[PDB]
Amino acid sequence: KVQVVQPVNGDPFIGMLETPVTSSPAIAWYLSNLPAYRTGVSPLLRGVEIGLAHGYLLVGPFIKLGPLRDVENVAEIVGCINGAATVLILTLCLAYGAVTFQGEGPQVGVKTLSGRSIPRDPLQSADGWNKFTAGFAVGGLSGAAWGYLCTQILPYY
Amino acid sequence: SHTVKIYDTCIGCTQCVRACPTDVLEMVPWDGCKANQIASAPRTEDCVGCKRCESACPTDFLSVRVYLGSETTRSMGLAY
Amino acid sequence: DVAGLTPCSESKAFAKRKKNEVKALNKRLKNYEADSAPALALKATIARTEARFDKYAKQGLLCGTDGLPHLIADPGLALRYGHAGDVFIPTIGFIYFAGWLGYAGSKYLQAVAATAKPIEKEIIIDVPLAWKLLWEGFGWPLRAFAEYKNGSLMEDDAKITVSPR
Amino acid sequence: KKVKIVVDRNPVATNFEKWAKPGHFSRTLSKGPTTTTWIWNLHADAHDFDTQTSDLEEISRKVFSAHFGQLGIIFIWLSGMYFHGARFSNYEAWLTDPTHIKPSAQVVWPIVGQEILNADVGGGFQGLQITSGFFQLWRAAGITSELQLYTTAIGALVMAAAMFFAGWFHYHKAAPKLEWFQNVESMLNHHLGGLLGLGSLAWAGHQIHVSLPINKLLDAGVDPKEIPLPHEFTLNPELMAQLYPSFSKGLAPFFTLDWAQYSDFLTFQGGLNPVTGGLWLTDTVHHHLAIAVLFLIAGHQYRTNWGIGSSLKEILEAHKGPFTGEGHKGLYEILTTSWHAQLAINLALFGSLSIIVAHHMYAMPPYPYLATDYGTQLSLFTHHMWIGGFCIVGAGAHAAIFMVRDYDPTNNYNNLLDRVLRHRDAIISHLNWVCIFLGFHSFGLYIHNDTMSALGRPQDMFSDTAIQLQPVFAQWVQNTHFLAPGFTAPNALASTSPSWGGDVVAVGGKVAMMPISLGTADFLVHHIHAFTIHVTVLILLKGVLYARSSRLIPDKANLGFRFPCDGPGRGGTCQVSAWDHVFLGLFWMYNSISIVIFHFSWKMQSDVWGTVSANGVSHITGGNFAQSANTINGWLRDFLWAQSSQVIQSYGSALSAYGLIFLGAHFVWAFSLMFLFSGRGYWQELIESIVWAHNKLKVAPAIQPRALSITQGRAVGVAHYLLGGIATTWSFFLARILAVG
Amino acid sequence: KYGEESRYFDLKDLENTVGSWDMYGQEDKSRYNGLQSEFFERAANGLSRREYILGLVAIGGAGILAWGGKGAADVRLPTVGPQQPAQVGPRGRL
Amino acid sequence: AFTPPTLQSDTPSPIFGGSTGGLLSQAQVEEFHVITWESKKEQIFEMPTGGAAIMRQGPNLLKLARKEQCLALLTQLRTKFKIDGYIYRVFPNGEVQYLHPKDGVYPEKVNAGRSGDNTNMRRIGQNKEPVQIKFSGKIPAEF
Ligand code: CLA
Ligand code: CLA
Ligand code: CLA
Ligand SMILES: CCCCCCCCCCCCCCCC(=O)OC[C@H](COP(=O)(O)OC[C@@H](O)CO)OC(=O)CCCCCCCCCCCCCCC
Ligand code: SF4
Ligand code: SF4
Q: Is D2 left (phi over 0), alpha (psi -120 to 50) or beta?
A: left
Backbone angles phi, psi at A18, to 5 degrees: -100, 115
Provide the angle, in degrees to the nearest 10, between the axes of the packed helices C12-29 and C37-58.
170
Q: CA A152, CA D103: separation in Å to the nearest integer? A: 70
Backbone angles phi, psi at D369, to 5 degrees: 55, 30
Backbone angles phi, psi at F15, to 5 degrees: -70, 115
CA atoms within 13 A on the CB side of D179: 8
Whether B52 has its CB under 8 Å from any CB of chain D: the answer is yes
Strands lying side by side in the sheet with F85-90: F58-64, F32-39, F85-90, F96-98
| SS3 of residue B50 by DSSP | coil
Please state the separation of Cα E93 from the chain's center in Å.
Answer: 52
∠ CA D353-D187-D174, nearest 5°, is 120
DSSP string spanning D120-168? Answer: --SSS--BEEP-S-HHHHHHHHT--SHHHHHHHHHHHHHHHHHHHHHHH
Nearest to C142 by CA among C103, C108, C116, C87: C103
Its sign, for the CA torsion F120, F122, F125, F127, is negative
| Residue D740, Cβ density class (10 Å: 0-12 exposed, 13-18 middle, ≥19 buried) | middle
Instruction: Say yes or no for a CB contact (<8 Å) between A2 and D322.
Output: yes
Residue-wise burial string across F76-109, b where 16 or more C-beta atoms lie within 10 A, e elsewhere:
bbeeeeebebbbbbbebeeebebbbbbeebbbee
Q: What are the start-end ranges of the E strands in chain C?
A: 6-7, 62-63, 69-70
Integer Rg of chain C from CA: 26
Tally of domains in chain F: 1
Instruction: Say yes or no for a CB contact (<8 Å) between F115 and B5.
Output: no
Q: Is C9 left (phi over 0), alpha (psi -120 to 50) or beta?
A: alpha
Whether B50 has its CB under 8 Å from any CB of chain D: the answer is yes
Assess contact for D554 and F22: CB atoms under 8 A.
no
Nearest to F37 by CA among F16, F66, F15, F57: F57
**Residue ranges making up the domain that contains F59:** 1-143
Whether D125 has its CB under 8 Å from any CB of chain C: the answer is yes
Nearest to F32 by CA among F86, F96, F79, F82: F96
Q: Which residues contact C159 (CB under 8 A, 6 or more apart)?
A: none
Q: Which residues contact F97 (CB under 8 A, 6 or more apart)?
A: F88, F89, F90, F91
Please state the separation of Cα E69 from the chain's center in Å.
Answer: 26
Residue-wise burial string across E60-82, b where 16 or more C-beta atoms lie within 10 A, e elsewhere:
beeeeeebeeebeeebeeeeeee
Nearest to D535 by CA among D442, D436, D443: D436
Question: Would you tell me how many other CB atoms lie within 10 Å of the CB of residue D442?
Answer: 20
User: Which one-letter amino acid corresponds to residue D468?
Assistant: Q
3-state SS string for D412-447 = CCCEHHHHHHCCHHHHHHHHHHHHHHHHHHHHHHHH
Q: CA D311, CA D293: separation in Å to the nearest integer? A: 22
Q: CA D203, CA D580: separation in Å to the nearest integer? A: 44
Backbone angles phi, psi at D80, to 5 degrees: -65, -40
Q: Is C78 left (phi over 0), alpha (psi -120 to 50) or beta?
A: alpha
Q: CA D519, CA D498: separation in Å to the nearest integer? A: 18
Q: How was this structure determined?
A: cryo-EM
Instruction: Say yes or no for a CB contact (<8 Å) between F10 and E19.
Output: no
Instruction: Say yes or no for a CB contact (<8 Å) between D323 and A17.
Output: no
| Residue C74, Cβ density class (10 Å: 0-12 exposed, 13-18 middle, ≥19 buried) | middle
Q: CA D244, CA D212: separation in Å to the nearest integer? A: 9
Q: CA A24, CA C143: separation in Å to the nearest integer? A: 91
Which candidate from F27, F63, F94 shows the least CB-CB separation from E8?
Answer: F63
For residue F39, give the H/E element and its range.
strand F32-39
Assess contact for D130 and D105: CB atoms under 8 A.
yes
Chain length of chain A: 157
Instruction: Say yes or no for a CB contact (<8 Å) between F16 and A11.
Output: no
Q: Which residues contact E92 (CB under 8 A, 6 or more apart)?
A: none
3-state SS string for D318-365 = CCCCCCCCCECCCHHHHHCCCHHHHHHHHHHHHHHHHHHHHHHHHHCC
Shortest distance between the Cα of E28 and any Cα of chain F, in A, equals 26
∠ CA E59-E61-E65, nearest 5°, is 115
**For chain E, first and last CA: distance in Å?**
82
Q: CA C46, CA C39: separation in Å to the nearest integer? A: 10
Assess contact for F128 and F116: CB atoms under 8 A.
no
Instruction: Tell whether residue B50 is among the known ligand binding residues.
Output: yes
Assess contact for C21 and C73: CB atoms under 8 A.
no
∠ CA D242-D243-D249, nearest 5°, is 65
Quick one: resolution in A?
Answer: 2.7
∠ CA F73-F76-F78, nearest 5°, is 110
Q: CA D206, CA D289: separation in Å to the nearest integer? A: 11
Shortest distance between the Cα of A54 and any Cα of chain F, in A, equals 29
| SS3 of residue C10 by DSSP | helix
Q: Which residues contact D667 (CB under 8 A, 6 or more apart)?
A: D724
Q: A-chain residues within 8 Å CB-CB of E81? A: none
Chain length of chain D: 741
| Residue D516, Cβ density class (10 Å: 0-12 exposed, 13-18 middle, ≥19 buried) | middle
Please state the separation of Cα D646 from the chain's center in Å.
Answer: 27
Rounded to the nearest 5 percent, the helix, strand and coil shares of chain D are 60, 5, 35
Whether F11 has its CB under 8 Å from any CB of chain E: the answer is yes
3-state SS string for D473-516 = HHHHHHHHHHCCECCCECCCCCCCCHHHCCCCEEECCEEEECCC
Backbone angles phi, psi at A36, to 5 degrees: -75, -30
Q: CA B46, CA F68: separation in Å to the nearest integer? A: 9
Q: CA D392, CA D593: separation in Å to the nearest integer? A: 12
Nearest to D208 by CA among D156, D144, D141: D141
For chain A, positions 70-99, list CB contacts with chain E under 8 A. 71, 73, 77, 80, 83-84, 87-88, 90-91, 94, 98
User: Which one-letter amino acid corresponds to residue F139?
Assistant: I
Alpha helices in D221-280 (DSSP H): 230-234, 237-243, 252-255
Provide the angle, in degrees to the nearest 10, between the axes of the packed helices D198-206 and D281-298.
160
- Rounded to the nearest 10°, the torsion over CA D721, D723, D727, D730 is 100
| SS3 of residue D638 by DSSP | helix
- Rounded to the nearest 10°, the torsion over CA B37, B43, B45, B48 is -60
Q: CA C74, CA C88: separation in Å to the nearest integer? A: 8
For D85, D87, D457, the CA distances from C36, given in Å and listed in that order, are: 20, 16, 63
Instruction: Tell whether residue B33 is among the known ligand binding residues.
Output: no
Range D217-220 contact pairs with CB under 8 angstroms and sequence separation of 24 or more: D217/D243, D218/D95, D218/D139, D218/D368, D219/D273, D219/D275, D219/D276, D219/D368
CA atoms within 13 A on the CB side of D200: 20
Nearest to D371 by CA among D282, D280, D276: D276
Q: CA F43, CA F69: separation in Å to the nearest integer? A: 20
Nearest to D94 by CA among D84, D106, D104, D83: D104
Q: CA E11, CA F63: separation in Å to the nearest integer? A: 12
The ligand whose atoms approach the alpha carbon of D318 most closely is 4
| SS3 of residue D105 by DSSP | strand
Assess contact for F6 and D370: CB atoms under 8 A.
no
Rounded to the nearest 5 percent, the helix, strand and coil shares of chain C are 65, 5, 35
3-state SS string for chain A = CCCCCEEHHHCCCECCEECCCCCCHHHHHHHHCCHHHCCCCCHHHHHHHHHHHHHHHCHHHHHHHCCCCCCCCHHHHHHHHHHHHHHHHHHHHHHHHHHHCCCCCCCCCEECCCCCEECCCCCCCHHHHHHHHHHHHHHHHHHHHHHHHHHHCCCCC
State the CATH architecture for A6-152: Up-down Bundle (1.20)
3-state SS string for D13-62 = CCCCCCCCCCCCCCCCCCCCCCECHHHHHHHHCCCCHHHHCCCHHHHHHH
Q: CA A89, CA F53: separation in Å to the nearest integer? A: 46
Q: Would you give the DSSP letter of residue D196?
A: I
Its sign, for the CA torsion D97, D99, D105, D109, is negative
Whether A121 has its CB under 8 Å from any CB of chain E: the answer is yes
Q: D-chain residues within 8 Å CB-CB of F52? A: 409-410, 412-413, 418
Q: Where are the domains of chain B?
A: 1-80
Q: CA D362, CA D379: separation in Å to the nearest integer? A: 10
